[PDB]
Each structure stands twice: as C-alpha cells, then as structure tokens.
Design a binder for these strands. Structure first.
Ligand SMILES: [Mg+2]
Length: 421
RNA sequence: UACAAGAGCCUUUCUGUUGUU
RNA sequence: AACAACAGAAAGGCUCUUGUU
C-alpha cells in the first residue's frame, strides 16, 4: 500500500503559488488560478421560489462568491448582466435562447435549483446540445447558508467550464511520458432502467488535448438496449484524434484508454472487442500510424475524523493478478464512512509502461479532477466520461430506435468546451 | 445539482446450485 | 435445457440521512 507523493499542484496568478495537498485535500487560500478567466458576462437563473430564496440573499451570495473568486484568481468583473427568476422545465429553452441572443460572448449561466427536478435535465439538454452553452447549477441550500468550501468548489467548476485551467501539475514533476505527445481517453456506457425496450444505452468517450492535461473534448453516441460494448468506438477515437491535431497542432504519439461502466463477469468479451476497436481506430487514419496502445478499465470498487485510508495509496500486488497488469488505487480520503480503493486493469500493454509510472500517471490524473481541491477515486478522464454519459442521459429525456443520437450530439461550440465537469 | 457514504424497497437481468416430473 | 420463486457478486434505479476549518 504505497502512498505516492501528491503532485505539487501548480497555481498561477501574481504569486504563482504551489499547493501541496495535505492528507489528500489542499486548501484554496492565497492561491490564484493558473489560467483563470476574466469572466466578462455571467448569468443568474433562479428556479427556486422567491419565498424560500430572496433577492437580497441571492445578491449576498453573488457578492461573497465574487470575493472568493477574486481571491481565487478568476475575476468576475462587476454584477451579472442577467439575473432572472424562472420555474418549470418547459421554460428553459426559451429563456436560454433569450439570454444567448442578448449578451454577446456569453460564458456562464448560474442556475439555482430547489433540490431534484426535471429542470436540471432540461437545463443541461438545452445548454449542451440544443444551444451550446456552459452552465453551473447549484441547490438552494448552498445559496443562503454558504461555506467557503462551497464557493471554492463553485469557482473550481466555473473556471474549468469556461476554457481555462484551474491548476496544471508540475511540468518538472510530471511523469516522463509527457516528454512525447500523449492523449488520454475515457469511456463509459449508461444503461437505462431495465424493462425499457425503447430507451437505449449511451456510449460516451472524452479525450485530452494539451500536454498540460486539463482540457477534454467529448464524443457520444447511442447504442442498443443493455449493450456493454461500443460499435463505433473507432470513429469516436478518430474524431478525437482529429480534434487533438486541430486544436493543439502537434502530432500525438501515445494513446491511453480509461474504460468505465463495464460489468466484472464479462471483462474478456469487452476487452476483445474494444481493444481491436482501438486498433482499427489507429489503422484507419494513415498507413503505419501505430501509437502505443494501452487499455485500462477502472471500476469504482489513522487519517482524518473517519479514520480511513489516506488519499494516494497504491496497491500493486497481493490482491492483484500476476500476469495481467492490474492494480488498485485509493486516492480519496474518507470524509464519512469508508474509502474505496479503485480497480484498474491493463492487458494491452504495447504502450510499454512501468508500473510505478502508470499509477503515478493515474494519481496525478485523479488530482487533475477540477471540481474539488482534493484527489478523487478514479481518474479525471474516466470521471468526465461518467459525467458526459450521465449528461447524455439527461439529454435523452422527454420534457427513434438508435437514431436518437442526434439528441445526444453535442453542439459545435461545446464540442471544445469541458462542459461535463 | 461540489465530494464521500450508508440502507431498505419491488421490477428484466450475471455466477450457478438444488427440485416433483 | 426450459419451468414460478430463489443465494449472492458485479454493473446499471430511486430515495433519504451521516459533515467540511
Ligand atoms: Mg458509470
């Protein structure tokens, strides 16, 4: 159970501070964002009732959020140009298309949601596919009784939804594989509630762009009922590779794959299909174009108040397969309950990797998750695959067959935007 | 709908065993 | 083999309560 050193997280701003995570979580005090966005225009969308969420309390939340953000290196310049109340899921598309066609260069819409409602599903469906926006929805309990960590997490998600980098790793502390170009992919499938013959399954992959890996793009399609494999995975990887070359202008050499949402009992069939699928992904672009292929499937399955595993523990043997390159990583502290050391499986190893380098890469990727200043259980790309699969699940909702992947196809503006996080 | 948990609940289902014929 | 009801695991469904410096 080797606890790897957490990455000395590189922040920016006037100080260029470096955050060292202590016990798996680092504070955001006196740390400006590395690539923070000067937020030109932003919007406030209240769906909570005015009885239980007042204008003065919303303005207090806006002011204190702006203070936390200015301390965070992501400045919001002035009061929001849009601050409207609303209600109902059916009143989302007209209001969103009203706010798009009023403020040019619109960046972020903050949406206030009283708990669980179809308003979240319609808000995400309008923002990510129909119109092409970036939104940040938060509950009512976090806009009157707010904490510094709540506003910090809000600012963390807002900074990454708007094209910037919250925090790079150390370029001197990054693993040596970044000496050559790399791309990191993450895949996940969402199945509907069973007995739904008309509701299909969702296959979603995401891919990293830059050599300072904090930016991802998505590609999602719709597949048949209860299918744990992707048919057109090769087209997904090819489109992601094209987008890599288009947005970064340097030729990739390595390929990493982080498969998620796959049952344990039938790993061999999924391996057999998707490995060959990534192979025809590589050989259907140019002759002799072979990157180093590796396939890692990851499956979400003292210290602190709860007394749990410190964030960063790596297990390489004694519970693992001898010949197969599989290992466990527990990279999240136990806030309440127990922490679950994640399982990681690599059979395709032509990417030729040392072990310790590979769990260092996955641990720094876990730290690269942008929605919290703490390491998370499974890496950032497979998280973003999970949230984009759940996002397409919110996209395929009411308020065909497999010709409904026009409803899970992301807009052109948002196809670059890290909207799922 | 920040992160990490826990349980019960009834629907097709993955590993199969037992069983009147 | 199928057979109504099964023992669980794993993936996928809810719902809540357990807190941050
Ligand atoms: Mg999943």
């Amino acid at each position: 159970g080797r606890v790897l050193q957490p990455p000395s997280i590189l922040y920016g701003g006037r100080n260029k501070a470096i955050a060292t995570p202590v016990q798996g979580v680092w504070d955001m005090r006196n740390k400006q964002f590395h690539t923070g966005i000067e937020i030109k225009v932003w919007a406030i969308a209240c769906f909570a009732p005015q009885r239980q969420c007042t204008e003065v309390h919303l303005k207090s939340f806006t002011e204190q959020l702006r203070k936390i953000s200015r301390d965070a290196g992501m400045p919001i310049q002035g009061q929001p140009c849009f601050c409207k109340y609303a209600q109902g899921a059916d009143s989302v598309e007209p209001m969103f298309r009203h706010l798009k066609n009023t403020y040019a260069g619109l960046q972020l819409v903050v949406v206030i949601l009283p708990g669980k409602t179809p308003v979240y599903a319609e808000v995400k469906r309008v923002g990510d596919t129909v119109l092409g926006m970036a939104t940040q929805c938060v509950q009512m309990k976090n806009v009157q009784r707010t904490t510094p960590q709540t506003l910090s997490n809000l600012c963390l998600k807002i900074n990454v939804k708007l094209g910037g980098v919250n925090n790079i790793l150390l370029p001197q502390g990054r693993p040596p594989v970044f000496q050559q170009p790399v791309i990191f992919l993450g895949a996940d499938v969402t199945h509907p509630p069973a007995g739904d013959g008309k509701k299909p399954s969702i296959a979603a992959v995401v891919g990293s762009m830059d050599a300072h890996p904090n930016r991802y793009c998505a590609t999602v399609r719709v597949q048949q009922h209860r299918q744990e494999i992707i048919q057109d995975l090769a087209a997904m990887v090819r489109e992601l590779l094209i987008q890599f070359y288009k947005s970064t202008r340097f030729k990739p050499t390595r390929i990493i794959f982080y498969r998620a949402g796959v049952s344990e009992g039938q790993f061999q069939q999924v391996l057999h299909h998707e490995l060959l699928a990534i192979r025809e992904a590589c050989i259907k672009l140019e002759k002799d174009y072979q990157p180093g292929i590796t396939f890692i499937v990851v499956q979400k399955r003292r210290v602190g108040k709860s007394g749990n595993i410190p964030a960063g523990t790596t297990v390489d043997t004694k519970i693992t397969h001898p010949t197969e390159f599989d290992f466990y990583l527990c990279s999240h502290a136990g806030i309440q309950g127990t922490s679950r050391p994640s399982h990681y499986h690599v059979l395709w190893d032509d990417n030729r990797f040392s072990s310790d380098e590979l769990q260092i890469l996955t641990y720094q990727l876990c730290h690269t998750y942008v929605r919290c200043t703490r390491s998370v259980s499974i890496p950032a790309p497979a998280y973003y695959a999970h949230l984009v699969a759940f996002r397409a699940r919110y996209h395929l909702v009411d308020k065909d067959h497999q010709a409904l992947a026009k409803a899970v196809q992301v807009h052109q503006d948002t196809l670059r935007t890290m909207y799922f996080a």
